[PDB]
Amino acid sequence: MQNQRIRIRLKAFDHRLIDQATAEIVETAKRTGAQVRGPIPLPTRKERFTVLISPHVNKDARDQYEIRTHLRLVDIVEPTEKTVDALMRLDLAAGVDVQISLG
Amino acid sequence: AENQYYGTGRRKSSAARVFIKPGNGKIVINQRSLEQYFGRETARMVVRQPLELVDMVEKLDLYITVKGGGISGQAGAIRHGITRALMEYDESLRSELRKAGFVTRDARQVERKKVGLRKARRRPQFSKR
Amino acid sequence: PRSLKKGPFIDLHLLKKVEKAVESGDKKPLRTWSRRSTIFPNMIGLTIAVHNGRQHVPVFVTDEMVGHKLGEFAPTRTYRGHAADKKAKKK
Amino acid sequence: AKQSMKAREVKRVALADKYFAKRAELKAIISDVNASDEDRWNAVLKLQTLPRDSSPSRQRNRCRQTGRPHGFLRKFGLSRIKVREAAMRGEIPGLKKASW
Amino acid sequence: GQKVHPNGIRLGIVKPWNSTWFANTKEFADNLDSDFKVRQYLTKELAKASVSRIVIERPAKSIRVTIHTARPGIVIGKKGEDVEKLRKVVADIAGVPAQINIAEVRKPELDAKLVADSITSQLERRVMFRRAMKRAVQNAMRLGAKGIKVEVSGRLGGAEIARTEWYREGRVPLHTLRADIDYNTSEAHTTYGVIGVKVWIFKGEILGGMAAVEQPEKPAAQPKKQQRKGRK
Amino acid sequence: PRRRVIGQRKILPDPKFGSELLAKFVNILMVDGKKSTAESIVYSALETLAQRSGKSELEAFEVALENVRPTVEVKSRRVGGSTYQVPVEVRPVRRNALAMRWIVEAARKRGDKSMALRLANELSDAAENKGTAVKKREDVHRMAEANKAFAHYRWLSLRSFSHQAGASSKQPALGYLN
RNA sequence: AGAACCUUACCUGGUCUUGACAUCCACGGAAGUUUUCAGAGAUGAGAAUGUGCCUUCGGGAACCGUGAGACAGGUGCUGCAUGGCUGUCGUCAGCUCGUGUUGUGAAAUGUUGGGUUAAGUCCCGCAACGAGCGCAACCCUUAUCCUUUGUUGCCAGCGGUCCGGCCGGGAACUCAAAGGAGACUGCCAGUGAUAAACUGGAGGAAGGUGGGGAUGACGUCAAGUCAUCAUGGCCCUUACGACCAGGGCUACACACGUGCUACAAUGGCGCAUACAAAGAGAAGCGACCUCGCGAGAGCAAGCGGACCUCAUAAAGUGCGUCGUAGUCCGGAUUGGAGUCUGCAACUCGACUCCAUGAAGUCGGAAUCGCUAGUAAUCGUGGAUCAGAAUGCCACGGUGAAUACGU
């Protein structure tokens, strides 16, 4: 059973920045390995809110809102030390956090 | 690679994976017997029906892995799953059933709970008097 | 249906008033506003005046009240009789 | 709506975190069954009177910044109406609605 | 009559949100207060021309400013010393060191908020509102809006009770989940009390903004480039 | 109102009996949304039916479903003065469903140890035309035969067609009344 | 959206009025913390740590006391005084923008006929013309299927091998989240004024803007919020404020809105048995451990979310048991104990359980949603959240009658 020996995950609440940043790491992985990598679509999260829509009078309408947190993974069928060294310089950072740790 | 024909059987948001081969009249579901998974319940009659319609209740073998159901329904993904795989013994078996309607992916999609309402379509009950 | 937990539940706050009254069995009716507390041996033999949401009502504490609270013997609500309008027995 | 309810509430939250965090097994020692004739006494209620004026049990996780009674949401630092006002104006990351 | 605003759920779909950051759904209150305090006070500092959008960003150990301007020239002030005083206080509010970069050619006269300011300015000084709002629209669609809707209210005409007005021209559809639907509600006072104008602008169905993207896409970078993950 | 034809949701034939009439029956036996309890309850009922009469599994089921089967309904159509209630023919879809519904509405008045025994006692009875829904069929065909003595806007209508170049009418219709 | 005190408006009682919190100045003090004692607590006395920031080395600021004024503060009055915002009619099928025409003109016409449609959807068409809002579309999400990924995902075959995707290894496979492929009366047929369009046919998962969500016009209604917040008119500013404590809206006279769960047999009781999707968790949650009578207790691996845990997912399924006896259904009330979250469970908080033991066998006026993943019914998780769920929000399981007629 193929797995990874070091975990890299990307977490953002804005979907467009993380898709670009992931794409730069997929190419890094293909430059520092032997296979054709791409996006792991790990289950993206949504937290659920309900609020008013008039400040006082009538409630037949209300509002429900979403905020999503989009999850990517970025791993070879087994990674190498040459992948983490290249990855960590080439990762984007402006509204996504990459955590390189396991937990 | 492939070594068995394969059906996907998606009905009611359950998926019957079905690996078909020559053998004897026989079912294994999730490495367990029929008395265990469908014992004496109406689901037992669901899964035998597509083998009985194709009269191969004695010479088809089956291996069944099923996810994402409830007990009677998973038998119903099996009802589509057996005929989905059996397209590669005869491709016109599945055509004629698709023309009658009698094999098809199930006709209901998801619908969500709506904004401000006590259910998917039920609005807030009020007397208002 | 329900009852409360274990240990003392005296606190700092009932303690300093009670302690100057317990050496002498009692001295004077103790001006109490922190009526959330449970009764205890240190609080027996006293008279604790228990703020009710408006004023203090004097409670003579006994050996029976030791499972009970302090503001429980003291009202918080209103009353009407069982099928007419009537002014409340309870402040 | 008043500043006095915001003023009580703001001081309670910084001292609930100060005072109760280092007095979280004291709760076990004086109430829970962790004691069995051990302590169960005045000497540790000498210390639990600090997390009392300012403690989680008096901090309804609300009105530490905004002047709206109830419907508060501790995760935004806001309330019903101000979550909606900020969505309208796009001042929250990722804010859309569910369509499924 | 009714007045609903429905387009509050569109603002990261074919347009940018006014904020993009990450907080692991636990630090969101602490990050939302810093993002407000940085919105409120930077647009007051560049008050010496106009701004069409403000976009606030959270890099690793940093807070990064994006700004959309009429020009990168005389909007932000001459000399980079003025743009360093902006980083001085942006850094103070978030609690990390601060960056700023300057962008974008888009005029704030295609955009909501300079249009809503300009129609309250007439009304504040009691000049006009019958045609002041129509010249707003004219001036807006000639730089790129396929349609604009305007609602003016206040104590209009010097009347002891309140009045309304409205005007729609071109297309402003709300049977949507996308488009740029770039929106501002002005609030200002005059010698009668408080007045306000509501401006919805439609630049395009996928135009308006610096965005076209609507999701996190999963076939991305890899449309038909398949791997076998084995025997290779 | 309806301005064109709209069909109905129905599922495929039975997993034991291979019949639509069985597939609608277990469906009308459904309680708590659960089709999977009503299936077993219907088949266990027909097996008792098979001990009562040794001729088929469906013997008292199919023929109950023949004897208590309605054909008519009453509609209300009245303007102005006095025109009374006005009958309509029921479509097959509702004939079948009225009968199965009346068979299980009737069935519940019994207390036994399985629902299957109950439903088997009402089918065996209705099969011999002594069921509880014999009355429900009879009432509905007597009322539909009675209320044809007078129907909607009848007096003025007998003029209205003849002057419009249009054919015979007695019933409310799109664009103009009868 | 979670009302013991806090919250919270209201009230009483302590305690003070440039004022409990900002900036500005004057004066004394570093702020903060820890701690004994009196006092309900605020407060006060005394103890112990520190003398920092800057400096004509005076003294000021931070923060606290106290004062001067600006000013803070006010659920203060006023919503025929407002700004911001939103309910209704309604998915009404109309409403409006630019403009010509017919009347003297208010105004009409368009916006009405025919066919078609939920629809002003769209064909034909008159001085009404063209076009936008409403609504159709792109949209997101889903569905077979095309497509990419290949873990915290999977295994027809092959290996280590207790035969478990744990792991060598593999991509036939579910599988997860996404671009979306597909469907247009275009195709073929009938109808219909050529036509729009309805219906049938076929391949396909599927023929009828694919399912689902978003989705709601101008705007009357003196609608309603000054209590998110803006804010004048306009009143108190030793207060129509505030620190501190306790109480309170869940009282009880009755009734009433709404939802849960139950009134059984399709089921409950016991025991055993089957597969979820979704998502949240560093004063939080959390396996195992020892402790305990269920409940729970501390110790602690672990935890960023297909990594560990809530979780045994339940309903549903199996057997034996149980009918009209209020039971073998339902188990409430309350006594009382064990437990919980919390200085604090009493009125007003969560859970286990023993004793005793009721209502309820389908309910009058009244009263609502539904065209199909719907209705119904079950469990799950989250927002709120110190502690309150039966509520709300979203998720997934099983999953129904019929739509002639207006």
How many CB pairs (< 8 A) connect C and D?
A: 29
Say which residues have a Cβ less than 8 Å from residue B98's Cβ, sequence separation at least 6: B104
**Residues E180, E136 within the same domain:** yes
- Residue D56 φ/ψ, nearest 5 degrees: -50, -25
Q: Per-domain residue ranges for chain C?
A: 2-80
Q: To 10 degrees, the CA torsion angle through E109, E115, E119, E124?
A: -100
The Cα–Cα gap between F64 and F73 comes to 20
Tell me whether E22 touches chain D (CB under 8 Å).
yes
The Cα–Cα gap between F140 and F73 comes to 7
Sign of the torsion formed by the C-alpha atoms of E89, E93, E99 and E105: negative
The Cα–Cα gap between E194 and E181 comes to 26
Q: Which domain holds residue E142?
A: 107-206
The Cα–Cα gap between E35 and A68 comes to 19
Say which residues have a Cβ less than 8 Å from residue E220's Cβ, sequence separation at least 6: A19, A22, A23, A38, A39
- Residue E185 φ/ψ, nearest 5 degrees: -115, 110
Q: To 10 degrees, the CA torsion angle through B124, B125, B128, B129?
A: -170
One-letter amino acid at F111 equals G
**Residues E135, E85 within the same domain:** no
Quickly tell me which residue has 């109430």 as its tokens: D31
Beta bridge partners of B60: B22
Smallest CA–CA distance, residue A87 to chain D, in Å, is 26
CA distances from F156 to F80, F148, F172, F177 (A): 12, 17, 13, 10
Of E5, E12, E32, the CB nearest to D88: E5
Q: Which chains touch B (3 or more CB pairs under 8 A)?
A: A, D, F
- Closest protein CA to C1' of nucleotide G369, residue: B122
- Closest protein CA to C1' of nucleotide G12, residue: C54
Beta bridge partners of E195: E188
- Residue A3 φ/ψ, nearest 5 degrees: -150, 170
The answer to whether residues E222 and A36 touch, using CB atoms and an 8 Å cutoff, is yes
**Residues E131, E189 within the same domain:** yes
**Residues E114, E197 within the same domain:** yes
CA C31 to chain centre: 11
| Reported resolution, Å | 14.7
Beta bridge partners of D95: A67
The answer to whether residues F27 and B29 touch, using CB atoms and an 8 Å cutoff, is no
How many CB pairs (< 8 A) connect B and D?
A: 6
Smallest CA–CA distance, residue D47 to chain C, in Å, is 9
- Three-state DSSP class for residue C90: coil
The Cα–Cα gap between F26 and F61 comes to 12
Quickly tell me which residue has 């006692």 as its tokens: F121
PDB experimental method: cryo-EM
Q: Which domain holds residue B76?
A: 3-129
- Boundary residue ending a domain (E78, E106, E134): E106
For residue A48, which residues of chain B lie inside 8 Å, CB to CB? none
The answer to whether residues A74 and A61 touch, using CB atoms and an 8 Å cutoff, is no
Q: Would the Cβ of B79 be found within 7 angstroms of any atom in strand G?
A: no
Say which residues have a Cβ less than 8 Å from residue E73's Cβ, sequence separation at least 6: none
Q: What is the CATH number of domain F20-143?
A: 1.10.455.10
Structurally, chain B folds into a number of domains equal to 1
Contact assignment for D30 to C7 by CB distance below 8 Å: yes
The Cα–Cα gap between D38 and D30 comes to 9
The Cα–Cα gap between A48 and A68 comes to 9
CA distances from E34 to D6, D11, D49, E31, E146 (A): 20, 20, 34, 5, 36
CA angle F6–F9–F11, rounded 5-degree value = 150
**Residue E197 lies inside a defined structural domain of this protein:** yes
- E107 secondary structure, DSSP code: -
Find the chain A residues whose C-beta atoms sit closer than 8 A to any C-beta of E: 2, 11-19, 22-23, 26-27, 34-39, 41, 44-45, 47, 53, 65, 69-70, 72, 77, 93-97
CA angle E213–E215–E217, rounded 5-degree value = 100
The answer to whether residues A80 and A30 touch, using CB atoms and an 8 Å cutoff, is no
CA atoms within 13 A on the CB side of E39: 20
How many CB pairs (< 8 A) connect A and D?
A: 43
* Helices F92-107/F115-126 angle, 10° precision: 120
Strands A9-12 and A63-73: antiparallel
Distance E229 CA to G183 C1' (A): 37
**Residues E113, E194 within the same domain:** yes
**Residue E230 lies inside a defined structural domain of this protein:** no
Q: To 10 degrees, the CA torsion angle through A89, A95, A99, A100?
A: -20
**Residue D8 lies inside a defined structural domain of this protein:** yes
Smallest CA–CA distance, residue B38 to chain F, in Å, is 12
Distance E39 CA to G139 C1' (A): 29
CA angle E189–E195–E196, rounded 5-degree value = 125
CA angle C91–D2–D6, rounded 5-degree value = 100
In the structure, do chain E and chain D come into contact, i.e. share 3 or more CB pairs under 8 Å? yes
Helical ranges in chain F per DSSP H: 20-28, 35-52, 59-67, 92-107, 115-126, 134-146, 154-163
Distance E195 CA to G86 C1' (A): 18
- Counted residue by residue, chain C has a size of 91
Beta bridge partners of C18: none
Contact assignment for A61 to B123 by CB distance below 8 Å: no
Say which residues have a Cβ less than 8 Å from residue E53's Cβ, sequence separation at least 6: E16, E18, E67, E68, E104, E106, E111
The Cα–Cα gap between E40 and A82 comes to 45
Find the chain E residues whose C-beta atoms sit closer than 8 A to any C-beta of A: 4, 9, 12, 17, 20-25, 57-60, 64, 211, 213, 215-222, 225-227, 229, 232
- Within 7 Å of a protein beta carbon, the nucleotides of strand G are 1-9, 11-13, 20-21, 33-42, 72-75, 80-89, 91, 96-98, 114-119, 132-145, 147-157, 164-180, 198-200, 202-207, 210-225, 227-232, 241-249, 251-254, 256-259, 265-267, 273-284, 295-299, 302-307, 313-319, 321-324, 333-353, 366-378, 381-387, 391-406
Contact assignment for E225 to A36 by CB distance below 8 Å: yes
The Cα–Cα gap between E23 and E33 comes to 12
Nucleotide nearest to E205 (CA to C1'): G138
Tell me whether D24 touches chain B (CB under 8 Å).
no
User: A5-103 domain in CATH 3.90.78.10?
Assistant: no
Q: Which chains touch A (3 or more CB pairs under 8 A)?
A: B, D, E
Among chain B residues 56-75, those with CB within 7 Å of any atom of strand G? 63, 65-74
Smallest CA–CA distance, residue A62 to chain B, in Å, is 5
Q: Which domain holds residue D41?
A: 1-90
Say which residues have a Cβ less than 8 Å from residue D55's Cβ, sequence separation at least 6: D12, D16, D19, D20
The answer to whether residues E182 and E208 touch, using CB atoms and an 8 Å cutoff, is yes
Q: How many other CB atoms are there within 10 angstroms of residue E60's CB atom? A: 12
Q: How far apart are the first and last CA of chain F?
A: 18
Among chain C residues 31-90, those with CB within 7 Å of any atom of strand G? 31-38, 51-55, 67, 69, 71-72, 76-85, 90
Q: Which residue of D has its CA nearest to E55?
A: D91
Q: How many other CB atoms are there within 10 angstroms of residue E93's CB atom? A: 19
- Closest protein CA to C1' of nucleotide G256, residue: B129
Structurally, chain D folds into a number of domains equal to 1
- Closest protein CA to C1' of nucleotide G322, residue: F113
Q: Which chains touch C (3 or more CB pairs under 8 A)?
A: D
The answer to whether residues B44 and B34 touch, using CB atoms and an 8 Å cutoff, is yes
Which secondary-structure segment (H or E) carries E199? strand E193-202
Q: Which has the closest alpha carbon to B97: B82, B75, B112, B119?
A: B82
CA angle A72–A77–A80, rounded 5-degree value = 95
Radius of gyration for the alpha carbons in chain A, expressed in angstroms and rounded: 19
Nucleotide nearest to C89 (CA to C1'): G251
Structurally, chain E folds into a number of domains equal to 2
Structure tokens at B19: 């690996």
**Residues E126, E89 within the same domain:** no
- Three-state DSSP class for residue B37: helix
Tell me whether B125 touches chain A (CB under 8 Å).
no
Smallest CA–CA distance, residue D51 to chain C, in Å, is 12
Q: How many other CB atoms are there within 10 angstroms of residue E197's CB atom? A: 27
The Cα–Cα gap between E89 and E97 comes to 10
The Cα–Cα gap between D25 and D40 comes to 13
The Cα–Cα gap between F48 and E18 comes to 72
Smallest CA–CA distance, residue D19 to chain B, in Å, is 41
Q: Would the Cβ of F94 be found within 7 angstroms of any atom in strand G?
A: yes
The Cα–Cα gap between E163 and E156 comes to 6
